Write an enzyme that holds these catalytic residues in place. Sequence first.
Site, mmCIF file in Angstrom:
data_model
loop_
_atom_site.group_PDB
_atom_site.id
_atom_site.type_symbol
_atom_site.label_atom_id
_atom_site.label_comp_id
_atom_site.label_asym_id
_atom_site.label_seq_id
_atom_site.Cartn_x
_atom_site.Cartn_y
_atom_site.Cartn_z
ATOM 1 N N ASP A 139 0.622 -1.270 -0.121
ATOM 2 C CA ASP A 139 -0.066 0.114 0.028
ATOM 3 C C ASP A 139 1.003 1.193 0.144
ATOM 4 O OD1 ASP A 139 -2.780 -0.229 -0.149
ATOM 5 O OD2 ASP A 139 -3.175 -0.112 2.203
ATOM 6 N N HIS B 139 -4.993 5.977 -2.253
ATOM 7 C CA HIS B 139 -5.073 4.653 -3.009
ATOM 8 C C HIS B 139 -5.096 3.376 -2.130
ATOM 9 C CE1 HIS B 139 -3.642 1.592 -6.295
ATOM 10 N NE2 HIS B 139 -4.051 2.438 -6.966
ATOM 11 N N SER C 284 -6.690 -1.026 -10.442
ATOM 12 C CA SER C 284 -6.384 -0.956 -9.207
ATOM 13 C C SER C 284 -7.513 -1.421 -8.105
ATOM 14 C CB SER C 284 -5.911 0.582 -8.653
ATOM 15 O OG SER C 284 -4.419 0.775 -9.065
#
Lengths: 639, 642
Positions: free
Chosen positions: B32, B103, B426
């Site tokens: 991450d 994200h 993603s």
Amino acid sequence: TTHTSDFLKLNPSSGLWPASGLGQDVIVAVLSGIWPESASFQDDGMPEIPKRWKGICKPGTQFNASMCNRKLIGANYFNKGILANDPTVNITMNSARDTDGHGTHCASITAGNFAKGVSHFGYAPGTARGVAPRARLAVYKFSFNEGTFTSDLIAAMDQAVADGVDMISISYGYRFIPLYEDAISIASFGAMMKGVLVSASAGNRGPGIGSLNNGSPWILCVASGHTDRTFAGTLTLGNGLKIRGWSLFPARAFVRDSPVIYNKTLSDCSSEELLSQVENPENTIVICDDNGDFSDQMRIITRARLKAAIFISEDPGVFRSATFPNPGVVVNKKEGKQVINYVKNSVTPTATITFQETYLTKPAPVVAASSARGPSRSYLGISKPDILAPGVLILAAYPPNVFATSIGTNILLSTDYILESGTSMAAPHAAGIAAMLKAAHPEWSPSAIRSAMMTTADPLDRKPIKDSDNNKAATPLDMGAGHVDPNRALDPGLVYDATPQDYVNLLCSLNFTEEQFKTIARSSASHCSNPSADLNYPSFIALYSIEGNFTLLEQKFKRTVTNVGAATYKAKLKAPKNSTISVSPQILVFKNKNEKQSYTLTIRYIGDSRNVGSITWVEQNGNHSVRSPIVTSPIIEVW
Amino acid sequence: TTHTSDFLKLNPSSGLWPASGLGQDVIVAVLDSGIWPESASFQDDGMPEIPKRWKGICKPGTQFNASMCNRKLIGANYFNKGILANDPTVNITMNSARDTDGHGTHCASITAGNFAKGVSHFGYAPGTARGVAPRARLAVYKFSFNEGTFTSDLIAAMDQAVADGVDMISISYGYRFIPLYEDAISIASFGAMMKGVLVSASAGNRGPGIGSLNNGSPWILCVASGHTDRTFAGTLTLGNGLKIRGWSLFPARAFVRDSPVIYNKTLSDCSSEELLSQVENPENTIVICDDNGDFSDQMRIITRARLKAAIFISEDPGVFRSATFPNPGVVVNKKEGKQVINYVKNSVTPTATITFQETYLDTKPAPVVAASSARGPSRSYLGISKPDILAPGVLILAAYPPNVFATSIGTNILLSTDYILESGTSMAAPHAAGIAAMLKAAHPEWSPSAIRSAMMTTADPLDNTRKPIKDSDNNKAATPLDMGAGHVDPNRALDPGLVYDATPQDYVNLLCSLNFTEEQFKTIARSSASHCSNPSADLNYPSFIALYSIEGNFTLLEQKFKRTVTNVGAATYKAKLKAPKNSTISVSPQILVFKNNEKQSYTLTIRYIGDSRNVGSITWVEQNGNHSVRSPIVTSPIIEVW
Ligand SMILES: *[C@@H]1O[C@H](CO)[C@@H](O[C@@H]2O[C@H](CO)[C@@H](O)[C@H](O)[C@H]2NC(C)=O)[C@H](O[C@@H]2O[C@@H](C)[C@@H](O)[C@@H](O)[C@@H]2O)[C@H]1NC(C)=O
Ligand SMILES: *[C@@H]1O[C@H](CO)[C@@H](O[C@@H]2O[C@H](CO)[C@@H](O)[C@H](O)[C@H]2NC(C)=O)[C@H](O[C@@H]2O[C@@H](C)[C@@H](O)[C@@H](O)[C@@H]2O)[C@H]1NC(C)=O
Ligand SMILES: *[C@@H]1O[C@H](CO)[C@@H](O[C@@H]2O[C@H](CO)[C@@H](O)[C@H](O)[C@H]2NC(C)=O)[C@H](O[C@@H]2O[C@@H](C)[C@@H](O)[C@@H](O)[C@@H]2O)[C@H]1NC(C)=O
Ligand SMILES: *[C@@H]1O[C@H](CO)[C@@H](O[C@@H]2O[C@H](CO)[C@@H](O)[C@H](O)[C@H]2NC(C)=O)[C@H](O[C@@H]2O[C@@H](C)[C@@H](O)[C@@H](O)[C@@H]2O)[C@H]1NC(C)=O
Ligand SMILES: *[C@@H]1O[C@H](CO)[C@@H](O[C@@H]2O[C@H](CO)[C@@H](O)[C@H](O)[C@H]2NC(C)=O)[C@H](O)[C@H]1NC(C)=O
Ligand SMILES: *[C@H]1O[C@H](CO)[C@@H](O)[C@H](O[C@@H]2O[C@@H](C)[C@@H](O)[C@@H](O)[C@@H]2O)[C@H]1NC(C)=O
């Protein structure tokens, strides 16, 4: 109304709500229509409609006879005034459907049903409900986009009284006219004659003296107070300084660690050209000096597309408005100094503001600066307004298809629930409370009910309630008896009662021509051999001419008080400044329920300025306290 | 993820969820930019105790302390040595697993977000958010920092995750243009596979050109991105009653009702600021924009000019992947665009009304392969078909850090949010990873390869209309090089009947047949295997690719594939064949009988000729049951490898 009933202490455990069943068995009429499909007007916890009721659900444009339910039980509209005025007119919304919003807002405030998860663009979130969540709604629309007519207003009221409504709520007012030309007063007299109390707004042309309307003896005249709720853009500076400023920007704007500038050349925030000279306007925060015109600053800022602005201002106008189309915060004068300091003593000063925060303020309530003020230029004789209630930035239902608020210069937003200010919002609060009182005591007259609400009102916020315009103690001409205290009003101990005949006698002492008399009366009484102006009222006003020399004056008031609690009361006196008062007897003994006892108050005063005092009948072997305010006042131009 | 699990048919009654306990006993690691722990998606309301097996740490750091973990977010670790070594002079602002980008938070919640009531993207896609596996345990490994992202940090994160005993790994990152022995994610993945941990990785977003994907490695689950059946509306109503459900994502309840609409060819282009600045009363007027292939520029010019709204004519797929909608407006297709212009020309006082924050779940067809989802074959290794599988990746709703830029209104207003819509492979990968994790919870003995098998041979190549899934870029049937086996079908994947299994040794043998120098070999394999006497490229894979040179004359070619299939259901299967266009295929045996874990092998043979990628398949359908084990087949040119 996601907080308002809490602010009033209303609750399911004890007090007015349980005692009244949240008003389920009572009916309150609201004189621009309604948006029926709102959550506030659904009937989830509603028992069957009381048989007594026979009102219609009158069909019309986009409104059919099935539009009613166990909550919104009646819907009627009155447009003949419009048509008579001009039969050439095409009324777009020819029914009780609201195309303005005012009517929907007022209706939900007074008897809106519980509505989960609502807010004003994130502000004031929670469950909305009327001050009387189970009261029945009867809508009477007299206000149309194409016009509002006096006669339609009267026709609406008369129809409501005729329908057997328990209470009437009307958030409209007219000024500059004598009683016999005053539509709401004429109709109210009729309502009172038939045991229906009318709650009306005092108006929003305060704070000048004698600026109120609906100041009639047979009307419950309501003023507007701030609550303890506030809305925040928390301001944090690059140096850690954290300030809870004011903001109502209607979205979760993201302004974090942005450059702040303070530049005297433009600090005024009044020049479009000047502001257009700040580079990278979209990433910079500008500070605006207090120049007495915030809303113009906001407009210039919005037009210039700044990241945000920090406004220095303590103008009460700012805190009554939901118009906040551009991210920014408003801070007071002291705080404004801290900020400017930080900026001057730094290269790279930055700020962060967050939005959509809402907090539950001292002191509160406070009389709104624009809440109209007594004495009544309709009738100086009787003190007005009567009572204070929440009216600043109140959350209530709203039509989903009309302009609500604004973002930037080009984006309009709509909503199901909106924040709105004015005596318009206050009145329906009183109406609902009055309705619940009437449900708890089905035999109480309109006058007694107003009495319960008044002699039980709280004049403290634990200091005396302030006038927002000057920050000094509010007068009875600002707030009447004070802030409604529903729960106490349930058990007032003593009430100052009155009868229809009593009002006729009062009307009679006005010495109008018999034609004028008939206009007001019109068919509830005939031209009246016992004229009497000393109407049994739960408050006192002592008037003094200002046409020449001022000389010691004296006044005597006769009151009768009936026991709604065996008990005895001792009178406590607080005489207005520069005056003396005395009562007699100084003690009232009561053998048993319903017994009546009279007394006389006497003031000796001199004019020059409106001073205040009071008289409280405190129970000796109990905890009852029957309070009545006293105010001296100049004699001003009447209408 | 307020709809996504519904779109996948997941539910508490039956299928993967109940069978797996929503993944409560399994652990998925997210490599991450870190995480925003205090999000509702990462609270632990329905979570049973943490499994003893787990001993991962909650590593302290900036604005993050050792109590930041819970029965949901059970692990947090970060890896910044690559950054420091690169430059010890650097001041890392957020020196911990706290997410300052978003994200990482988005991916984490998509894969294992806990139920979160009453969320939305500024009114759109409202509902309850939850990960594809709502009770799976989260282990966060942050290797991506604002100040830099380092290959070695990535590898260090993966290795630590495998070492921690993670059940699955989710990574939404990819690098292109490098051979396997320089491919960080591949190197680490090989290690993960060797130790029974499956890695889900995104195929990338440089589609739709051929061989544009990354993470196309035999030991990786390579995920492509599909649209769902969800759409977002500015319903457009004209003054003449005409009502059109156009597209809009304006992030507020704008009020545009009975406003004047204009259509003026001189400016209809919506490309001139000056021109647009010539329309009077811009703040109360709606302008129509012709299709000029650059919507986002039109939106910018419109936003800058402060029009009430704009009606955009456009069918460009780029429009339907973006949440950037700073000014009220609607997008309509070409036909609808004609209706509107008509209405306007045939009227004085043409007006329009647009409403916003509407979201519909009715779209047909769906799914659809996103135009930008990267395409096979793998320039990392042409040998094995990629990508493997399709999953929802366009405009997915997931958690987001509350203190970062989310979207925009006007030219000057930025907004932030707790839950945001985001598109890309993603978003797809974490969907697969969660499903893979639940499969593993339902069958604790299944290998990474078997689990990828269950998901593939059980995937659906048809859309909600029952036609073959389309490629959004051309509107023709999607290839296995576009979507692998097809759209994940979790519930079926629970009971695949047959699996194409494989072992660590099998990958070594494959790696071995690549004929790298032994140094290169060591780089990839590092210490899970040694330099390997049984080289073998025919890795037992649930799909087939047949390659053909394009350097000169094209001549009939032939290929033979050997597969072994183990029975996870006594049963017998008959092979059904569909040969790719301009080619023939044959299998043998044509029937597989199973006495009771028994293994059975077979050989597929294709005869084809090149020129263009044709598709077919082979399905093993059970005769006395309802199992259907499907494997796609695709022919492909031999393209430049890295
Ligand atoms: C009120 O509505 C009327 C229709 O019910 C309008 O007149 C009808 O108007 C149509 C619109 O122009 C027209 O086509 C029809 O011939 C006409 N017929 C009838 C009997 O309704 C009316 O508009 C006014 O009167 C019409 C006849 C025209 O002269 C217009 O110029 C007038 O505005 C509407 N009234 C208003 C004030 O809007
Ligand atoms: C404070 O107020 C003014 C904001 O417009 C600035 O003056 C303006 O500066 C512009 C270039 O920055 C220039 O084009 C304008 O003509 C000018 N306007 C006026 C009324 O002077 C001012 O900037 C300072 O003063 C100007 C004249 C230049 O010397 C700048 O270099 C100075 O920074 C603003 N900022 C400050 C620190 O005063
Ligand atoms: C890395 O963080 C350091 C400590 O927070 C920064 O050094 C410190 O910067 C302060 C503001 O400039 C200053 O008051 C301190 O005295 C200084 N030194 C120390 C030991 O804290 C450092 O800032 C860089 O180095 C300093 C010395 C200045 O030269 C700045 O120009 C540099 O930015 C931080 N480094 C960076 C690249 O931000
Ligand atoms: C369609 O757009 C044209 C470009 O904006 C309009 O012309 C512009 O009109 C402006 C005033 O409306 C004027 O200040 C601009 O100089 C002019 N610019 C150009 C490039 O033509 C046009 O407006 C019509 O024609 C102009 C010249 C004026 O006569 C207007 O009154 C006319 O409406 C545009 N035509 C449209 C609405 O019909
Ligand atoms: C570790 O971080 C937590 C997160 O806040 C700290 O707990 C908070 O402490 C502040 C005091 O400044 C409280 O206002 C918060 O409500 C606390 N929340 C809770 C319940 O944790 C915690 O104190 C930190 N511990 C250490 C050792 O720093
Ligand atoms: C009027 O109220 C609403 C608002 O238009 C209408 O939808 C109703 O339509 C009619 O009645 C309902 C119950 C439904 O059966 C519908 O199909 C009908 O056309 C209308 N209600 C009534 C009682 O007329």
